[PDB]
Amino acid sequence: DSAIFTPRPDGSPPPEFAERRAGAPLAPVTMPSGDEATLAVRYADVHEVLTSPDFSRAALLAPEAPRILPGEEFGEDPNALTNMDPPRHTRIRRVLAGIFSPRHVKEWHPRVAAMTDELVGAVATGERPVDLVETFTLPLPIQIMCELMGVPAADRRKFQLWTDMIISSTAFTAEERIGAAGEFTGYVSELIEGRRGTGGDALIDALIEAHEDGERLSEAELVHLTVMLIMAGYETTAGVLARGLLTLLTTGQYRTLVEEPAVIPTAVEEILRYEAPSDGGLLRMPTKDVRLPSGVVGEGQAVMPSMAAANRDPEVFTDPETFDVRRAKCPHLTFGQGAHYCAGANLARHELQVALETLTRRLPDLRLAVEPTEIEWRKGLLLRGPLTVPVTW
Ligand code: HEM
Numbered sequence: 001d002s003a004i005f006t007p008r009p010d011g012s013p014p015p016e017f018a019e020r021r022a023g024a025p026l027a028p029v030t031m032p033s034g035d036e037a038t039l040a041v042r043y044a045d046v047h048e049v050l051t052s053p054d055f056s057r058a059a060l061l062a063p064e065a066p067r068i069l070p071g072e073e074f075g076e077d078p079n080a081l082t083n084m085d086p087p088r089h090t091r092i093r094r095v096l097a098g099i100f101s102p103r104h105v106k107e108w109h110p111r112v113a114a115m116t117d118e119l120v121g122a123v124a125t126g127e128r129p130v131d132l133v134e135t136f137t138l139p140l141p142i143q144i145m146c147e148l149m150g151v152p153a154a155d156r157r158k159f160q161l162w163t164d165m166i167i168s169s170t171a172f173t174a175e176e177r178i179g180a181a182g183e184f185t186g187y188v189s190e191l192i193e194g195r196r197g198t199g200g201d202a203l204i205d206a207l208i209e210a211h212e213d214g215e216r217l218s219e220a221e222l223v224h225l226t227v228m229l230i231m232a233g234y235e236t237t238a239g240v241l242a243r244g245l246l247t248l249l250t251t252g253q254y255r256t257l258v259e260e261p262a263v264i265p266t267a268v269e270e271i272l273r274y275e276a277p278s279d280g281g282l283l284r285m286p287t288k289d290v291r292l293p294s295g296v297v298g299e300g301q302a303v304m305p306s307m308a309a310a311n312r313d314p315e316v317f318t319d320p321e322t323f324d325v326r327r328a329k330c331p332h333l334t335f336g337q338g339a340h341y342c343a344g345a346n347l348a349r350h351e352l353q354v355a356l357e358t359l360t361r362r363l364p365d366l367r368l369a370v371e372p373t374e375i376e377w378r379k380g381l382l383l384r385g386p387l388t389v390p391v392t393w
Contacts, residue, residue: 002032002069002170002380004039004279004306009377011243011275011384017041017309025294029304032381035066037283037302041309043316043333044293049305051338055284058085066283066302068382069169074181075282079224082282082340089339092225095216096343099206105346107201108148112347112354115143120358129369129392133242136359137389141237144351145230148203150195158187163231167383181227188226203229229344236277237348239378239385240334241355244271246375246389249368253325257356258364267325268352273332274323276308280381281336307333365393 001007005014020027020041029039040046049055059065061078077083081092098104119140123130139156142163146156162180165172172180196208207226211217217225248254248267257264283302290297297303311332312320318329335342342348359366369390376387 002382004029004031004381007379008384010372010375011247011377011386013308013312014279017279017306017312021309021313026292026297026303031066031068031280031304033067033070035068037066037068037304038297039280039304039306040292041306041313042294043310043313046305046307046310046333047337048290048292049284049297049303050333050336050340052290053086053339054286054288054290055303056085056287057083057089057282057284057340059285059287060283060302065285068280068283068304071169071174073169073174073177074166077224079218079220080228081221081225081343082228086339091216092221093339093343095210095214096225099203099210100343100346102346104206105350108203108347109350111147112144112351113358115147116140116351116354116358119143120362124362129390132245132389132391133238133387137242137245137355138238140241140355141351142230142234145233149226149230150191150200150202150204155187159184159230160234163234167231167235170380184227185223188223188230192222192226233344233347235383237351239277239383240272240275240348241352242389243275243277243385244352245359246368246372246386247271247275247323248325249366249389249391250372251323253323254360254366256325258360261357261360263325264353264356264360266327266330267356268349269330269332270323270325270327271352272334272349273311273317273327273330276311276332276334277383277385278381279306279308279384281305281307282340305333307336363393366391367393 005016008014020039025042025045026038026040028036030036040049061076061083119136123135142160143156146159151159162184165180166177192208195204196212207222211219211222257267281304283304285302286297286299288299311334314320335345369392378384
C-alpha cells in the first residue's frame with residue numbers, strides 16, 4: 001500500500017485528517033517510504049505552504065531528503081517542472097502560461113467537444129449495463145491529450161498502458177516502469193521529429209515552437225514536459241471524473257444537473273473539492289523557519305501539504321463533509337496554489353464541464369447498476385479513485 005493512513009474502501013477521507021485539523025495541525029506523519037514529514041491539513045496552513053517563497057521543491061532531489069514512496073522513481077528527474085525552483089521554474093512557467101492561455105485553450109474547445117461526443121455517443125448506442133470507467137472516464141482525458149499532442153488514434157492505448165504502468169508504483173517493478181518511461185520518451189522524441197516545422201496549431205506544436213523559435217525550452221525540458229503533460233492530463237482528470245460521476249450518481253445529484261444544467265459549473269468545482277484525488281502532495285522543503293498560521297515549520301524539515309484535507313476544512317467550507325453541487329463558495333486547492341499551480345487547470349475544468357454537459361444531455365436517466373459498496377478503489381495517497389463505475393439507463 002501507498003495510502004497515507006489506513007487504506008480505505010471508498011472515497012471518504014481518513015479520520016486522521018479531522019483529528020489533526022482539530023488537535024495536531026502540523027505534526028509528523030510516516031510516509032510509505034518510512035521517512036517522516038510534517039503533514040499540513042488545515043486550509044490556512046496548506047495554502048501558505050503552497051504559496052510562500054520560503055519553500056523549495058528542488059531540495060527534495062538531494063540525497064538525504066525525505067521521499068514519499070520507497071525506491072528511486074521518476075519524480076527525481078531534475079528536468080521535471082514539479083522538481084524546479086525559480087529562476088528556472090519561472091522561465092518554464094511563463095512559457096506554459098502563454099501556451100495554456102485562455103485564448104489558446106478556447107481554440108481547443110472544438111476538439112474537446114468532438115472527442116466527448118464520440119465517447120458518449122458510443123456509450124449511448126451500445127449495450128447496457130456498461131462500466132463507465134473503461135468506456136468513458138478513462139478514455140476521454142487520454143484521447144484528448146493524444147489529439148492535442150498529434151498522436152495517432154492507433155497509439156492511444158500504448159500511451160494509456162505506459163502511463164498506468166509508470167504511475168502504479170505498487171503494481172509493477174522499477175525495471176518495468178523504467179522500460180515504459182523509456183518507450184514513452186522515445187516515442188515522444190520521434191513524434192516531435194515528425195511534427196516539428198509542419199505548421200500545426202496543436203499543443204505539441206506550441207511546445208516545439210517554444211524550443212525552436214523562442215529557445216525558451218531546452219530539448220530535455222521539451223521532451224519531459226510533453227510526457228508529463230500527457231500523463232497528468234490523463235490520470236488526474238480521469239480519476240476526478242470517475243470519482244465525481246460516482247458521487248453524483250450515489251447522491252442523486254446527477255438528476256439535479258439533468259433538470260437544471262445551469263448548475264454544472266458549480267458542480268464541477270464541488271467535484272474538484274470533494275473528490276480531490278490525492279490525500280497528500282509533493283513535499284515542500286522550508287529553506288528557513290517558516291511561520292504558518294498554526295505554528296512554525298523548521299528549516300530543513302519537509303512539509304506534506306494535503307490539499308484534500310484543506311478542501312474539507314470547516315473554517316473555509318461550511319458543512320465541509322456535505323457534497324452539494326449548488327455550493328457557491330468553493331475555493332478548493334485541488335489545482336494547488338502558488339508557483340506550481342496546475343498549468344492545465346483551464347483545460348481540465350473545461351473537460352469536466354463538457355463531460356457533465358454531454359452525459360446529462362444524452363443520458364439523462366443514467367444510474368448506478370450496482371450498489372456502491374461493490375466497487376473497488378485505488379488506495380494510494382497520490383491518486384485514489386474507483387476501479388469501475390457500472391451504470392445503466
Ligand atoms: C482534474 C485534473 C487535474 C488536477 C486535479 C490537477 C492537479 C494538479 C496539482 C494539485 C498540481 C500542483 C502539484 C503541487 O504543487 O504539488 C498540478 C500541477 C501541474 N499540472 Fe495539473 N491537474 C489536473 C489536470 C492537468 C491537465 C489537464 C494538465 C495538462 C494538460 C496538467 C498539467 C500540470 C502540470 C504541467 C503541472 C506542474 C506545474 C508546475 O509544477 O509548475 N494538469 N496539477
